Symmetry: C2
Subunit: 45 residues, 2 copies
Amino acid sequence: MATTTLGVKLDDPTRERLKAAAQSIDRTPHWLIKQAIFNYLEKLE
Amino acid sequence: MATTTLGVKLDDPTRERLKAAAQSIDRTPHWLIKQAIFNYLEKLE
């Protein structure tokens, strides 16, 4: 997908919590970040 | 905040849509990304 790489603002502590978000679908952390950002749009869309 | 900088996976088209998310609180795009990721945790928290 048109994934342009921008610097994100995540904290180690927070980054671990994202793993839980990845666990919801069972995907990779970096890859989870894309859902957490784009899926976040689809959620509140 | 402990904002560690990781490369994100955003698309220009998608990045513009984030601006709408920033418009919800009226904040800065980069800065919106942190909410879109952390607020996304607080939302589904």
